[PDB]
Structure 1
Amino acid sequence: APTAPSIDMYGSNNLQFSKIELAMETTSGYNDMVKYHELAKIKVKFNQWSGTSGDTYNVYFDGVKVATGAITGSQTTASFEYGQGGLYQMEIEACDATGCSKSAPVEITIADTDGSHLKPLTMNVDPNNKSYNTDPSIVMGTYFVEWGIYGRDYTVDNMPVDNLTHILYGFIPICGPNESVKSVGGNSFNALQTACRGVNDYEVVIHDPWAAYQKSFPQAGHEYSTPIKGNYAMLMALKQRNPDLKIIPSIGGWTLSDPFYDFVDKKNRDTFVASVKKFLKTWKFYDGVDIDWEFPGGGGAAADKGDPVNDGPAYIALMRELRVMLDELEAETGRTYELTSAIGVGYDKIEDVDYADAVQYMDYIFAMTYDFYGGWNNVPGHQTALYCGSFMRPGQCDGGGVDENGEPYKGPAYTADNGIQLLLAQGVPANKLVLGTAMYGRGWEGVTPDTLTDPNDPMTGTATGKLKGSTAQGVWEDGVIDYKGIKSFMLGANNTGINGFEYGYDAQAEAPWVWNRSTGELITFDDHRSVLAKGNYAKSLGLAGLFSWEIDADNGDILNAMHEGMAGGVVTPPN
């Protein structure tokens, strides 16, 4: 028989092959950094120095023949293409009329972006996240933010994945007009300019390729030479651990919505929709797309954008067009892909979209039932309440009243139930609506007792400015604090108040607060009680479930309460 091939490990890239080429140690345009191949090119060098070399080689993976070719003398390169990622035991055989001889087996890795070559992720979850048996029909969602791996030190293996059905990855930008990004300062705008170099306007890109696929995480077993690293390789490994998890890219958000206002022109929708199809073929761990346009009709970060007449019909066409495209991917892959969107729930945001038309294309609407009041002005209120608080004036709740100047309210007050009932009354099915819960507070300073019109209720006071604090306290920007910061610096373990704060609860609104009467610091947030009230409300109305912004800011208490409030319930999944 021929001499047995001897595989040259170093001549064959130590047997690590990848369907995706990702630039490392540089930051450039997205199309220069990312290249995806439907088939990996596998080149393996072998030699047969003594004896006869034979005529033909065969390559086997786990005992099954996957390639064949000609022997070229004493040194041959087996060259072939292969579609399915994975880890395989490879043998190379050489054959002639006298028989065949085979190399020892050796492990070959074929990387792909579904994580098929990866072991299940090793988790490091805070043990305060508890175990539940929530019915699998109920949505339990959260947002994981790409920049959370910096100062916030919160990585994919920290997520309590057994307690989640959906992870929304915040946020994928659209190339084009993006002046709103300059509002976060730092390098965010400039990093987008880099990512969009050589990219057509209105196509998606990865904003931070260091966080997404270059950074080596030692807890994931990454090495500097591993072909896919970053949060994306950890999400691939997380999907190997929890295969029924849905991981969905969230496009837009508050700072990254400016390009959506040009989707009134179909040509820019077509560009965008094609880029999303390419994105989901490239990054196969993702299960759909979430569109967080804030907001049709305006009222978001860009003060000079928003068209109440035309943005709603653009949003609806976008959804129609994205569902056509996802149906093509389902035909191609045999997989199911979801289309979702996070939406404003003030009456003046809902009135700009005919959701009865849009929602026929969509699996879920993540209703943003939070940010109703906040440090952008000096008016206290409940930022994430179900119902109207004691602080509101007569006729403020339903908008029939007048304000303190005698001016008509323009619509119903900002509460979760006022927005859910506006959506239901126009025919959006309850089982497509997912109710938002806040894992953060918004707050003020200067709300001292002398400013209250009702002494029992600090939401009747007036602020002098935003809450101020440090990042160790969970205050990453003025006026906003992580829930785990409120728990460590204002509630304490018994939930009865520390550091001069007192806890209170508006039982009408279903909304908690902490208030330091000395500093006038007042913070509106969600807590165990108010999250249990949201789960009861969701069960009462047959909503799809609950989601939360943002998972790094919880200590486990808010996701635990999301599950606790849903116990016993089931829902009909949308078809």
Structure 2
Amino acid sequence: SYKLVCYFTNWSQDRQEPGKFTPENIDPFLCSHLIYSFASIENNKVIIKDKSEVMLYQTINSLKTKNPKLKILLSIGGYLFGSKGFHPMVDSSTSRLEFINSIILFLRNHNFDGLDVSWIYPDQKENTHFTVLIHELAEAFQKDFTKSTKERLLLTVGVSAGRQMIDNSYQVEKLAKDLDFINLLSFDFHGSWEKPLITGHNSPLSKGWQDRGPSSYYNVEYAVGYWIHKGMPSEKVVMGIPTYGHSFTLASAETTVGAPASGPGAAGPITESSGFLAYYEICQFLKGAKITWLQDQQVPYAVKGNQWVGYDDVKSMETKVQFLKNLNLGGAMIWSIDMDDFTGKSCNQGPYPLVQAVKRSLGSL
């Protein structure tokens, strides 16, 4: 009994094949939870800015018709929403209450089962506001369920896997009460924003051999453990796994971890964004590359020419799943199913090779 919580996005629809994803591409039995990314906030109220908003509602109802066990949530936030997106809604209880009531009506009208708040990030400044908003939602949700024939709206949150960010942003014990679970964002541990600019893996399970001091923090094992230590019960920890990798353009001839990089990797042809590659792009890149499995860190990286791609593959799916079960975690979260090879047409491994491996690994006694 593990959750498989699957984020998907509303921007992947503008991609060319085979990055071209709509909710209609979703398998109703693939995951236990679906989270739509992202909603917006206009007039201290919840909306959806998506030209496919209405067809999405239609797909939601089809999905839940085919799988009555399926739970679909709505997410607010993300890296680009930032902290700014939550202003001015959080600035007072009045505007906050206006919001919380928009949410309840919204989710009921549209057949969502809860809400994800993935605020990136509260940090020091907004620690208080984030805490308060979560508590007011949690309470309003409970209150609403008091007067209901419906199951109660679930509340989750996408949270930092970064030690310092966790220290600055969260009151964990409070969070443990208010949230049904965290979606631990246990990736983006390394990437081309770093200084000094050196190759590093986006989502390492374990410590690197060269990791010392606060680099010892930048792995999944650590992140997960620190959350539990800070108060979050293990079963409320839902462990994020990525379907993308972080890329680097190599400065010199070192191809190792910690090798100097001139900048982010060449942009994928489909995701057109230098620094990362979806898995369906990674599979093309792997043709003619040399791949190394890191023993220390338990994940692969691939080199082809001056390109260095740290990524996650079927082998790390199964490896990460064993770890999360060993630690009695609540399950697995995926960012994002629409960057797996969902069509099956690039990796020739069937549809959703990575997520499918995760399902199987959780499902296996």
Q: Give TM-score, length-normalised by structure 2.
A: 0.89
1:261 Cα deviation from its structure 2 partner:
5.8
Alignment match, 1:490: 285
Q: Could you list the runs of 5+ residues in structure 1 that have no partner in the other structure?
A: 1-136, 176-199, 214-229, 298-307, 399-412, 492-497, 570-575
Q: 1:469 to 1:397 in 2, by over 3 A?
A: closer
> In 1, are the aligned partners of 2:268 and 2:276 still within 8 Å (CA)?
no
Provide the C-alpha distance between the structure 2 equivalents of 1:565 and 1:237, rounded to a whole number of angstroms: 27
Provide the C-alpha distance between the structure 1 equivalents of 2:152 and 2:274, rounded to a whole number of angstroms: 41
> In 2, are the aligned partners of 1:147 and 1:211 still within 8 Å (CA)?
no
Alignment match, 1:212: 53
Alignment match, 1:355: 172
Alignment match, 1:346: 162
Amino acid aligned to 1:490 = F
2:215 paired with 1:419: no
Alignment match, 2:275: 479
Provide the C-alpha distance between the structure 2 equivalents of 1:174 and 1:373, rounded to a whole number of angstroms: 31
Q: 1:564 to 1:390 in 2, by over 3 A?
A: farther
2:234 paired with 1:430: yes
Amino acid aligned to 1:275 = S
Query: Which gives a bigger RCO, structure 1 or 2 (Cα 8 Å, sep 6+)?
Result: 2
2:118 paired with 1:292: yes
> In 1, are the aligned partners of 2:246 and 2:277 still within 8 Å (CA)?
yes
- Aligned positions of 1:117-136 closer than 5 A: none
> In 1, are the aligned partners of 2:268 and 2:281 still within 8 Å (CA)?
no
Q: 1:504 to 1:239 in 2, by over 3 A?
A: same
2:86 paired with 1:260: yes
Q: 1:239 to 1:567 in 2, by over 3 A?
A: closer
State the secondary structure of the residue aligned to 1:566: helix
Amino acid aligned to 2:313 = D
Amino acid aligned to 1:486 = I
> In 2, are the aligned partners of 1:447 and 1:458 still within 8 Å (CA)?
no
**Length, aligned pairs only:** 346
State the secondary structure of the residue aligned to 1:464: strand
The structure 1 residue matched to 2:294, chosen from 506, 521, 529, is: 506
> In 2, are the aligned partners of 1:444 and 1:463 still within 8 Å (CA)?
yes
Listed one character per residue, the Cα deviations across residues 406-425 of structure 1 (whole Å, up to 9, x for unaligned) are xxxxxxx3211222111111
Alignment match, 2:127: 312
- Aligned positions of 1:17-416 closer than 5 A: 137-151=1-15, 152-175=19-42, 200=43, 202-208=44-50, 210-213=51-54, 230-257=55-82, 258-260=84-86, 263=90, 265-283=92-110, 285-297=111-123, 308=124, 311-330=126-145, 331-352=147-168, 353-377=170-194, 378-392=197-211, 394-398=212-216, 413-416=217-220
2:361 paired with 1:565: yes
Amino acid aligned to 1:428 = M
1:549 Cα deviation from its structure 2 partner:
0.9
CA-based RMSD:
1.8
Provide the C-alpha distance between the structure 2 equivalents of 1:142 and 1:281, rounded to a whole number of angstroms: 21
Provide the C-alpha distance between the structure 2 equivalents of 1:244 and 1:267, rounded to a whole number of angstroms: 35
Q: 1:485 to 1:295 in 2, by over 3 A?
A: same
Listed one character per residue, the Cα deviations across residues 179-223 of structure 1 (whole Å, up to 9, x for unaligned) are xxxxxxxxxxxxxxxxxxxxx2x2221112x2111xxxxxxxxxx
Structure 1 stretches of 4+ moved >4 Å? none
Identity of aligned residues (%): 24
Provide the C-alpha distance between the structure 2 equivalents of 1:470 and 1:313, rounded to a whole number of angstroms: 39
1:508 Cα deviation from its structure 2 partner:
1.5
Q: 1:286 to 1:345 in 2, by over 3 A?
A: same
Q: Could you list the runs of 5+ residues in structure 2 that have no partner in the other structure?
A: 342-351
Q: Give TM-score, length-normalised by structure 1.
A: 0.58
State the secondary structure of the residue aligned to 2:223: helix
Provide the C-alpha distance between the structure 2 equivalents of 1:264 and 1:537, rounded to a whole number of angstroms: 41
Provide the C-alpha distance between the structure 1 equivalents of 2:109 and 2:150, rounded to a whole number of angstroms: 16
Provide the C-alpha distance between the structure 1 equivalents of 2:96 and 2:220, rounded to a whole number of angstroms: 31
Amino acid aligned to 2:49 = H
2:250 paired with 1:466: no
State the secondary structure of the residue aligned to 1:171: strand
State the secondary structure of the residue aligned to 1:162: coil
> In 2, are the aligned partners of 1:146 and 1:171 still within 8 Å (CA)?
yes
> In 2, are the aligned partners of 1:364 and 1:432 still within 8 Å (CA)?
yes
> In 2, are the aligned partners of 1:382 and 1:389 still within 8 Å (CA)?
no
Q: 1:203 to 1:341 in 2, by over 3 A?
A: same
Provide the C-alpha distance between the structure 2 equivalents of 1:562 and 1:568, rounded to a whole number of angstroms: 10
1:397 Cα deviation from its structure 2 partner:
4.3
State the secondary structure of the residue aligned to 1:552: coil
Q: 1:391 to 1:528 in 2, by over 3 A?
A: farther
2:264 paired with 1:445: no
